[PDB]
Amino acid sequence: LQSLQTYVTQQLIRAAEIRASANLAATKMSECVLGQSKRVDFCGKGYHL
Amino acid sequence: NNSIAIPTNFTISVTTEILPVSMTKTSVDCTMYICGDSTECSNLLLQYGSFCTQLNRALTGIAVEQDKNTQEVFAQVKQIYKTPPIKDFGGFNFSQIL
Amino acid sequence: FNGLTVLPPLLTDEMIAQYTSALLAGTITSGWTFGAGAALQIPFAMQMAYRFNGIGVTQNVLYENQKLIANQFNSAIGKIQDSLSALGKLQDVV
Amino acid sequence: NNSIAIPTNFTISVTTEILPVSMTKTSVDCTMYICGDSTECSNLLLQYGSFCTQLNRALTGIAVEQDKNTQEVFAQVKQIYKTPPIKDFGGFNFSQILPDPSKPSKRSFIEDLLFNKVFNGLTVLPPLLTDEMIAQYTSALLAGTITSGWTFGAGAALQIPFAMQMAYRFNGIGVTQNVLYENQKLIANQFNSAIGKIQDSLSSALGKLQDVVNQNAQALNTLVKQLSSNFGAISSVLNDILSRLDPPEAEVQIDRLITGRLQSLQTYVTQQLIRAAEIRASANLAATKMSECVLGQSKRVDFCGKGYHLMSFPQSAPHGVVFLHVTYVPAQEKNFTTAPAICHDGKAHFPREGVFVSNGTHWFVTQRNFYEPQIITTDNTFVSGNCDVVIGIVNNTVYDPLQPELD
Amino acid sequence: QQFGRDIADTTDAVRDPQTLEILDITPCSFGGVSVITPGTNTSNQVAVLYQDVNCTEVNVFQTRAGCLIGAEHVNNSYECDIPIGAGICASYQTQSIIAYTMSLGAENSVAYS
Numbered sequence: 001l002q003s004l005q006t007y008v009t010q011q012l013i014r015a016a017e018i019r020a021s022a023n024l025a026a027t028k029m030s031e032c033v034l035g036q037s038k039r040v041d042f043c044g045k046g047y048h049l
Numbered sequence: 050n051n052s053i054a055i056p057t058n059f060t061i062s063v064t065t066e067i068l069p070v071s072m073t074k075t076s077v078d079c080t081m082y083i084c085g086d087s088t089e090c091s092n093l094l095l096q097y098g099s100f101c102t103q104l105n106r107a108l109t110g111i112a113v114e115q116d117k118n119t120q121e122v123f124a125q126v127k128q129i130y131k132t133p134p135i136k137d138f139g140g141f142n143f144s145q146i147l
Numbered sequence: 148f149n150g151l152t153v154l155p156p157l158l159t160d161e162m163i164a165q166y167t168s169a170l171l172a173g174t175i176t177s178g179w180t181f182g183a184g185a186a187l188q189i190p191f192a193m194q195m196a197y198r199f200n201g202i203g204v205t206q207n208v209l210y211e212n213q214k215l216i217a218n219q220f221n222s223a224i225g226k227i228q229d230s231l232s233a234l235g236k237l238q239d240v241v
Numbered sequence: 242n243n244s245i246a247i248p249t250n251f252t253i254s255v256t257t258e259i260l261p262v263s264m265t266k267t268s269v270d271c272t273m274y275i276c277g278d279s280t281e282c283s284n285l286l287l288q289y290g291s292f293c294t295q296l297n298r299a300l301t302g303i304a305v306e307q308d309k310n311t312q313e314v315f316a317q318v319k320q321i322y323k324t325p326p327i328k329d330f331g332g333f334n335f336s337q338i339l340p341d342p343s344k345p346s347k348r349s350f351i352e353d354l355l356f357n358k359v360f361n362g363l364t365v366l367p368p369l370l371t372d373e374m375i376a377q378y379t380s381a382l383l384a385g386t387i388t389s390g391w392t393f394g395a396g397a398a399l400q401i402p403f404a405m406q407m408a409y410r411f412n413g414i415g416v417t418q419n420v421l422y423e424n425q426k427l428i429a430n431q432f433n434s435a436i437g438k439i440q441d442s443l444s445s446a447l448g449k450l451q452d453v454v455n456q457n458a459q460a461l462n463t464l465v466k467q468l469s470s471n472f473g474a475i476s477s478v479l480n481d482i483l484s485r486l487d488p489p490e491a492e493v494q495i496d497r498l499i500t501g502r503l504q505s506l507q508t509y510v511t512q513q514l515i516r517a518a519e520i521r522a523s524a525n526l527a528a529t530k531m532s533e534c535v536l537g538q539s540k541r542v543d544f545c546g547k548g549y550h551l552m553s554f555p556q557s558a559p560h561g562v563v564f565l566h567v568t569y570v571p572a573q574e575k576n577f578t579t580a581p582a583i584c585h586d587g588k589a590h591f592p593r594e595g596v597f598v599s600n601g602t603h604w605f606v607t608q609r610n611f612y613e614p615q616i617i618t619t620d621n622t623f624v625s626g627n628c629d630v631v632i633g634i635v636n637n638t639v640y641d642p643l644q645p646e647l648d
Numbered sequence: 649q650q651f652g653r654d655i656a657d658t659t660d661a662v663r664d665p666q667t668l669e670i671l672d673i674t675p676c677s678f679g680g681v682s683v684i685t686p687g688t689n690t691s692n693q694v695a696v697l698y699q700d701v702n703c704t705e706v707n708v709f710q711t712r713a714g715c716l717i718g719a720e721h722v723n724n725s726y727e728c729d730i731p732i733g734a735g736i737c738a739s740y741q742t743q744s745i746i747a748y749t750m751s752l753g754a755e756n757s758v759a760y761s
């Protein structure tokens with residue numbers, strides 16, 4: 001039971017990080033692909049096309 | 050205090066950025082893992098309350114948000130647009146990503 | 148395994164690729180208008196003129212360096228395959 | 242190669258976004274939970290060191306974080322602004338969202354709908370800011386954004402007529418002021434219609450906020466219900482074991498209950514820590530959205546709603562915010578023929594701010610987002626080079642204003 | 649029906665066997681005890697509140713957070729110093745501990761026309 005509980009806790013902690021990454025990716029898809037971003041270094045290095 | 054430098058040319062550069070969006074949706078049955086389908090072990094385990102229900106619920110929530118991540122990243126278009134057969138794009142050649 | 152199962156993802160790789168294709172086609176054809184409403188077509192050269200105007204460069208630069216810019220873009224796209232033919236951030240997850 | 246689509250009309254659409262900002266503050270007591278008025282259990286519990294200062298510390302940290310979330314999201318305005326008694330906003334009607342002092346807690350219609358739409362060692366600490374204070378924060382934010390525009394976020398509030406503010410916003414999107422001023426009544430009418438339609442849709446949904454409440458409640462119920470579990474002992478109750486067995490022999494049987502309850506409490510605290518991390522991320526997003534969509538416009542696409550952002554209004558919810566994003570959605574497009582440049586007298590011309598279009602015979606210059614044909618003159622056009630390098634050049638005439646009037 | 653219990657199987661209502669009358673069950677007040685200190689560097693005059701305890705069963709002030717003893721409620725309003733709850737918080741202003749409702753800020757009526 002303790003082994004299973006440890007596994008589930010690390011799974012929750014990893015899922016939080018993956019959700020942060022997915023939220024960033026959705027932001028990038030909205031802002032760099034559906035438009036042109038003035039934010040520097042957000043959509044690559046140099047002025048974004 | 051009176052020097053400026055103006056570029057006279059430019060370069061078009063392409064870079065790659067890689068981001069994860071989802072994991073594998075793995076589920077574990079607490080009763081079968083803890084006891085391995087023996088009746089007396091199951092009877093002794095069910096004295097422990099609802100640990101197994103809690104673990105199952107946590108894993109289910111993980112899987113549901115795993116689906117939600119992909120859905121929110123990729124479903125940002127209503128229609129399904131199509132490229133016209135003619136590829137007149139002013140000289141730009143998108144044949145490697147289309 | 149011992150009571151362990153892995154569920155299939157709701158969206159097949161096929162439909163994810165289809166979303167990516169739809170986004171690519173919308174960007175190439177309609178510019179950025181398709182994210183704010185209906186897709187409105189525009190020739191690609193004029194859309195690049197808009198985008199040069201967006202970074203503080205007059206649009207004539209594109210129209211008089213179109214051939215050079217297209218060649219640079221094609222070469223830079225070609226270099227990506229070589230740089231790929233890396234993904235450690237994805238492999239670490241699995 | 243030579244076809245463009247340009248909108249001729251537009252629609253103002255208001256869309257809502259709900260976003261959790263906090264969760265209920267709770268505390269537990271080890272002595273009352275594990276033992277519950279039993280000296281022998283308390284004597285045995287100290288054998289485990291300080292496993293019960295840490296749980297209280299973790300829960301206290303969660304509670305203080307919960308207060309800071311609301312403080313950051315809402316208390317972003319230094320003063321409390323008031324709307325004037327007389328409300329002439331150029332035809333716009335904010336009576337649905339503006340707070341009214343005729344009911345309870347000075348709430349608004351939509352806030353009222355939005356609020357209607359949703360023991361043994363345990364305590365639920367009250368939140369620091371009551372609903373009335375959050376209500377007057379939101380009312381101050383609306384009053385500031387209605388009277389001053391975005392100037393009250395950058396310093397002292399500077400009053401400006403509402404129509405002129407909306408013209409500023411249109412200019413920010415990329416549409417000239419005359420588009421606002423020539424059809425102000427239509428814009429006000431469809432804004433009012435949309436803000437009534439959101440009311441209707443809400444009257445008949447708010448699941449993101451309910452999920453947090455449900456999940457916290459079920460976690461607490463599991464924690465309570467875990468008290469009646471035997472954990473491999475004689476019985477669940479601590480009296481039925483002390484009052485029926487020899488304490489030297491019932492000492493071993495107490496330890497099972499202590500260990501089980503300690504595990505249950507630890508699991509509860511760990512889940513609460515993870516959930517608090519998630520709720521804090523959501524609150525940070527809400528604070529950013531407030532500062533960027535309410536205290537100004539946003540050029541970021543799909544950040545303050547679908548479409549071209551104009552302005553936003555916050556509304557207090559039971560444990561969150563509700564943003565009413567109003568956006569400019571172009572519609573009724575028709576397709577013309579374009580050209581990158583105009584060659585006149587062997588000289589290349591480019592549009593100063595628009596694009597060259599043609600209805601078949603004549604050529605015009607229109608702005609990119611709204612159809613407004615103009616005669617191609619030297620005032621809205623600049624010259625660079627000669628018409629032999631640009632591909633797609635067409636031929637026509639460019640009008641110089643001085644020549645016709647001089648002679 | 650002898651006795652009644654709600655959710656969490658808490659026996660909350662019983663009928664006496666003599667009169668056949670139905671009654672209520674309510675646990676007597678339990679809660680925490682928290683001190684409100686202005687810091688030993690400044691003074692030693694502390695205050696105490698008892699969370700969600702009616703203080704008829706404990707100079708004295710009653711709040712939604714509990715009953716606070718040792719500080720005098722002032723009907724003035726200041727900026728928050730030591731948070732307590734329910735919009736009420738305490739400070740150390742002249743010489744003694746005072747408790748008041750929070751001030752959100754100054755009022756402005758912007759000259760809109």
Ligand SMILES: *[C@@H]1O[C@H](CO)[C@@H](O[C@@H]2O[C@H](CO)[C@@H](O)[C@H](O)[C@H]2NC(C)=O)[C@H](O)[C@H]1NC(C)=O
Pocket residue numbers: 057058059060215218219
């Ligand atoms: C600006 O840079 C481009 C390349 O980035 C230069 O184009 C090269 O010019 C040389 C000599 O004229 C040729 O040998 C190369 O083949 C050209 N490269 C490409 C990709 O066409 C260009 O000369 C530079 N200067 C100006 C004024 O454009």
Ligand SMILES: *[C@@H]1O[C@H](CO)[C@@H](O[C@@H]2O[C@H](CO)[C@@H](O)[C@H](O)[C@H]2NC(C)=O)[C@H](O)[C@H]1NC(C)=O
Pocket residue numbers: 136142143144
């Ligand atoms: C876009 O690029 C691709 C590859 O870089 C071009 O495909 C090549 O086309 C030539 C003929 O022009 C063939 O001889 C090659 O075998 C093709 N290579 C492939 C398919 O890998 C393609 O022609 C380019 N697009 C245009 C319009 O020229």
Ligand SMILES: *[C@@H]1O[C@H](CO)[C@@H](O[C@@H]2O[C@H](CO)[C@@H](O)[C@H](O)[C@H]2NC(C)=O)[C@H](O)[C@H]1NC(C)=O
Pocket residue numbers: 249250251427430431573
């Ligand atoms: C732009 O759209 C608005 C409404 O979306 C049009 O106004 C409508 O006009 C018709 C006929 O004149 C009326 O029956 C409707 O009641 C109007 N609607 C509203 C909301 O006022 C307007 O005519 C359109 N403009 C153009 C140029 O087509």
Ligand SMILES: *[C@@H]1O[C@H](CO)[C@@H](O[C@@H]2O[C@H](CO)[C@@H](O)[C@H](O)[C@H]2NC(C)=O)[C@H](O)[C@H]1NC(C)=O
Pocket residue numbers: 334335336337437
């Ligand atoms: C602004 O809108 C509100 C509600 O949409 C208007 O108040 C209602 O208007 C209707 C239609 O005339 C009346 O039947 C109701 O009695 C009004 N009061 C309510 C619903 O409480 C309000 O009149 C509008 N503002 C102006 C200046 O007309």
Ligand SMILES: *[C@@H]1O[C@H](CO)[C@@H](O[C@@H]2O[C@H](CO)[C@@H](O)[C@H](O)[C@H]2NC(C)=O)[C@H](O)[C@H]1NC(C)=O
Pocket residue numbers: 574575576577
């Ligand atoms: C954009 O303008 C073009 C210009 O003709 C339109 O193209 C034709 O439109 C008719 C009208 O229904 C269709 O029947 C044809 O199939 C279209 N294509 C041709 C003739 O090749 C196009 O429909 C316009 N699109 C919009 C959305 O207005």
Ligand SMILES: *[C@@H]1O[C@H](CO)[C@@H](O[C@@H]2O[C@H](CO)[C@@H](O)[C@H](O)[C@H]2NC(C)=O)[C@H](O)[C@H]1NC(C)=O
Pocket residue numbers: 600601602603
């Ligand atoms: C394209 O638009 C122009 C706008 O000037 C049209 O030119 C005028 O159209 C009106 C409409 O009846 C005529 O009365 C004028 O005599 C036209 N010329 C001028 C100088 O005003 C033109 O007809 C339109 N073309 C099409 C195919 O609709």
Ligand SMILES: *[C@@H]1O[C@H](CO)[C@@H](O[C@@H]2O[C@H](CO)[C@@H](O)[C@H](O)[C@H]2NC(C)=O)[C@H](O)[C@H]1NC(C)=O
Pocket residue numbers: 584634635636
């Ligand atoms: C735009 O105008 C120029 C100037 O008239 C055109 O160039 C002429 O083209 C004709 C047709 O071949 C020749 O007979 C003339 O000798 C050319 N003159 C010059 C000065 O170049 C040009 O063809 C026109 N472009 C279009 C697309 O009509």
Ligand SMILES: *[C@@H]1O[C@H](CO)[C@@H](O)[C@H](O)[C@H]1NC(C)=O
Pocket residue numbers: 137242243632633
């Ligand atoms: C676009 O395609 C048409 C199709 O014949 C062609 O006539 C035209 O020249 C092309 N545009 C450019 C800029 O070459």
Ligand SMILES: *[C@@H]1O[C@H](CO)[C@@H](O)[C@H](O)[C@H]1NC(C)=O
Pocket residue numbers: 689690
């Ligand atoms: C601490 O005490 C010193 C000496 O009385 C005083 O000057 C200082 O202001 C105090 N710090 C506080 C009250 O934060």
Ligand SMILES: *[C@@H]1O[C@H](CO)[C@@H](O)[C@H](O)[C@H]1NC(C)=O
Pocket residue numbers: 702703704710
């Ligand atoms: C507290 O007790 C008093 C006296 O028993 C009673 O009048 C009052 O309603 C109770 N509750 C509050 C909030 O004062």
Ligand SMILES: *[C@@H]1O[C@H](CO)[C@@H](O)[C@H](O)[C@H]1NC(C)=O
Pocket residue numbers: 721722723
């Ligand atoms: C404060 O003023 C209000 C005014 O209505 C009054 O009701 C209240 O009793 C006063 N309290 C004190 C402590 O002066």
